[PDB]
Assembly symmetry: D3
């Protein structure tokens, strides 16, 4: 009954939308859609919850990716089969540089490919680079709403734990290749870790699709505080504001 | 109030469970749990839906992993922090060998690592191999219900599309190293594709955890039919019966 | 005059044998054959000594592989051209885990591929995994004769010295990639080192042949004692008993 | 008497310059410098010819890199030791996409790393990405002079011949991994080949330096014409005007 | 009673020998030793048969390596522990270039590393190169007996079958990365295949030992004839005469 | 007007020359040519300065390569299109072994491939090995003029700074893969670092061209002195004498 294998959507469901905002968490989709006009629930299958809304009179889709490159790759492919050509990722993230503060915004120009799915689209030599128009719209949007913004490289990991050098785990073990890797990325000016951008950016850049990514900083691993839940939600809302404002300039 | 970062579970929720049945789809969790005694919904956050039930008087957890190694690695880690030591993967799958029929059951001895998350636990040379006791229990359980069973190697891909050499896609492109890859795996006796076992098996085998995997066949790509909804349901139930029977012998 | 390039055997020499027991040392072949009925010498060319015997009325071949993947790959290929479909490796080995004692038996489910010849059959991503029927027969055989058995992963090295992190050598040097590697394997639960199983298991698993491996523990590198020669021979004989008993269940 | 090993320059020679325009050809340096105020020849050693000039009252250096990552890496390092923090690459290039015409301008967002020197600064997974402020200034400058501009990915090769899949050569041979590579890059949206950007961008992005790249199109390999000398000169001047205008906004 | 783990030799057995002639086949050792003065059998264990003889009044050892890098690496290590510093490989080989005729002699300057054991001594980027003094002595010796000699690169494979692109095998399959590989080596001027030189040369070059290799051509795969037994014997003797003559100048 | 894309040369310019001496520095070419008869300037384009001269009545070309594999690869290809079949590299170099003294001569048998351009001609497994005739001529020439000569392996790096483990740099950073690499090469008997030989030797050895390399030692990194400029020039002249004398024996 669906037109795609996983999302549970038909072409008609999108009502001509060609831009998607793609958060990770299905439970966050509704909140984003409600910033815009006539928000409606389209489907919820597996980790993929999708809502439609209208932005300056144009249909947009908000669709969750789940955690990681593999589910992200399914969402992007199936949305592309449904007519989406522009993908904007919104998230919240840690930072790994001392000058980046909680509440700041990160716009990702390109990703360190510590994932597997990106390799299914392009060999490692190929850059996991964002579309310039999307990045520009995100930077301008952040400037417009008075954000403190950092623009640069993000490390994109297939794991939350060892790939980000976390040792407070069941085994306490980090495999050799990843032990000391965080210090390496820090030394090269990498801003932060997350888990989807290498796949998203590589997939889009090699498939004629436009992608960008913005995130709000909720923790800094170099001066690590327990996040205040109110502050997290405020930073999340701030990043969501930026991604929607950027989308307006990409329609 | 959660004891873990993603699953929204406490140690108390598990009531001493040390075995988890782990399907991919959150909506499949309830149906598996309800085959056992005193099933109770625990939590639903992101792609992770968890239920507790009782098997021969012992608590067991059913928890979804989402699609792909990255979310699987989070579920396994956090379940391990909550006391789970044995993980049984249940799924439905296609097959890529002519002798494997729809309705047959596949037990996976090891995976071809076409993923990224497995590398965050062990270098590529390390085998993505199942635990012998889990594999034995699954094979025995399949025999007990009179299944037609194939035991062998599964190719575990970070993508549904190019990594499984699908061409009916947005771009119709498959990157060089995956072009012709399906024929290679077929020639080497690989049974099927799926998207989580390389991570699950590598992780568990390198972290002192036990893992096995069973799947019901719903399609064969060498003799490809549209699956019948009734047949898929019966195959799902057949495979679920096998995984629960295996769990009985692993408590 | 021979039917194969290296083994010095004809098809008729095997008298219908479809199972081979494959030790490393040519000088050990006769001893194994003599456990069975009507043992006869077939050939001795290079490192390949072969004997025929009968097990429960069926011809079996015992053929040495020499040390390493390359000569093993020749033996397996040429035996396969002579009708052998099942290969059981028997050896004696060190262990690298504290809980494994001298005189214990190891059944290998899969190998860490620290060899070169396995790559000539399958890319690194492919698992060097044993056949489930062979592994089951070996586990059951070990259980039957009262062995203390460990089941799991073996590191399979192209060298005896640097690849197993031995420093009491001519140069005392271990190349960077291998320095500290033993600790890595130990941390991942690897049981032991040997030198042929990655090739044997990868070759067989990718070529439609069945293979398994059992070994007797003669030394433990974590609590390292000089082996008593009588104890070594007894452990060797015990492992040989197990491999022959397993073979009976694979005919 | 030089402050650096190769360039033959002193700190004093730069007169406080912190921005460099870096063409490949030493003979191109004078022409670029003479577009600005008070141009002066500084030094010529090996492939490194350097001139100083003034732009809006501020000192800027023009320095050639030679062909390839290795000489580029020397120039960037030694210029950084002399106070340069911003590097703008100017070149002329072919194109490999049908929609890109002779006389068009290419701004590079990131490079495919088909080089070796980039690996001496960051592992392959790290993106060879341009600085956002530099890329923005180049795009804005191109707009200011009314250029037809394409913004995207460039393939950066350590060779002119096999790495760009040229067959009209001494041997007519292209090694396996480069045979068919051009079609791969074309399918992934790559604009053009050149020979320095992977090193330049990776180096700068991992060392806290800012880099961008602009190039004028002189030939298109999908519709290959012999370039007219007059047209090439005009295109060179057009691109040089763009890089100088961008430099104005980066001082 | 042995001083080494595998060879069954004592320091005394060598009587001060510091040069070894190392054929692959244990049965070839006696014939080589008997060309020199006072030949004596030392030991035969596994694939390692050793004889001592005298050349211009000086002790030399002839010791077999078995097939492949792994057993070769054991022989070289243990001979080095027994005082051997110079290793001369003697073999017979096929050729893969049309200009190389049966009965010709090949002196190997370096090897293509299609093995695994070489990597246990040096990373892949390190050249599997022969010692200049050994190569010179072999070339001079070949000239002294009036050989037709080709000097160049040999491809050194961990397998006899797929790594040398043989298809007349059990499976008839050659894994992707070896399919078409022979044509690649031919185009690059590679003379021949064998199975030990990558390990021998890499090991020796990285461990302060001297190694060279000479081989007599018995077949040419571009103009493939069944070898005549008489011709092979003559070619063997011709090559053995060369290796002994070279040894004279390396004492 | 030129017959090649970069060198600015025609076939006639070479007057039948089939041997090239290839230094790095364009400003050094004239000095080398003037050792021979009738030296004349042919062209100076980019980093490629070429002079013709006559050696024992035969035309020879001296042509600079610039720094690095990429420009070297252009020079070699274009000279080959102009009829050059033999390439002799002359340089001055550091040494990394304690026994090598300033003023000594190094003849390179093969290179460690720490470059990128070599991979555009042959996969990493292929040896970056010099031609035996060229190496022999260089060794004999060094012996003839009373040089103190070391023959062996050179590490060939795409960078001057991090690839040779230099820390007195702008960032002071050396990427993980290269940190501690110098000690590794020293332990394997590598003589020295330079920047072009991996490309030159790999390219030539795989393309049917003959290449060799000789260098004068101007510094030893293990007992590091500031070079005396007079000593440097004398050592340079000594190495130039050797390369020209070798060329006489290769015509
Ligand atoms: Na997921
Ligand atoms: Na062997
Ligand atoms: Na250059």
């Amino acid at each position: 009954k669906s037109d795609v294998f996983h999302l549970g959507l038909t072409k008609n469901d999108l009502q001509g939308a060609t831009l998607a905002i793609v958060p990770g968490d299905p439970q966050r989709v509704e909140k984003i859609a409600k910033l815009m006009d006539n928000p409606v629930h389209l489907a919820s299958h597996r980790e993929f919850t999708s809502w439609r809304a209208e932005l300056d009179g144009k249909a947009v889709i908000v669709c969750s990716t789940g955690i990681g490159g593999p589910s992200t790759s399914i969402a992007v492919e199936e949305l592309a089969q449904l007519g989406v050509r522009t993908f904007l990722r919104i998230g919240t993230t840690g930072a790994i540089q001392p000058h980046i503060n909680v509440g700041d915004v990160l716009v990702t120009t390109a990703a360190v490919r510590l994932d597997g799915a990106s390799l299914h689209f392009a060999p490692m030599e190929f850059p996991a680079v964002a579309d310039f128009s999307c990045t520009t719209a995100l930077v301008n949007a952040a400037k417009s709403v008075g954000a403190t913004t950092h623009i640069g490289i993000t490390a994109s990991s297939d794991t939350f734990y060892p790939g980000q050098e976390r040792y407070d785990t069941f085994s306490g073990r980090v495999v050799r290749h990843f032990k000391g890797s965080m210090e390496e990325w820090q030394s090269m000016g990498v801003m932060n870790y997350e888990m989807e951008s290498a796949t998203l950016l590589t997939m889009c850049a090699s498939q004629g699709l436009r992608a960008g990514m913005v995130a709000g900083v909720i923790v800094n691993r170099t001066q690590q505080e327990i996040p205040n839940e109110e502050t997290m939600k405020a930073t999340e809302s701030h990043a969501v504001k930026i991604v929607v404002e950027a989308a307006r300039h990409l329609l």
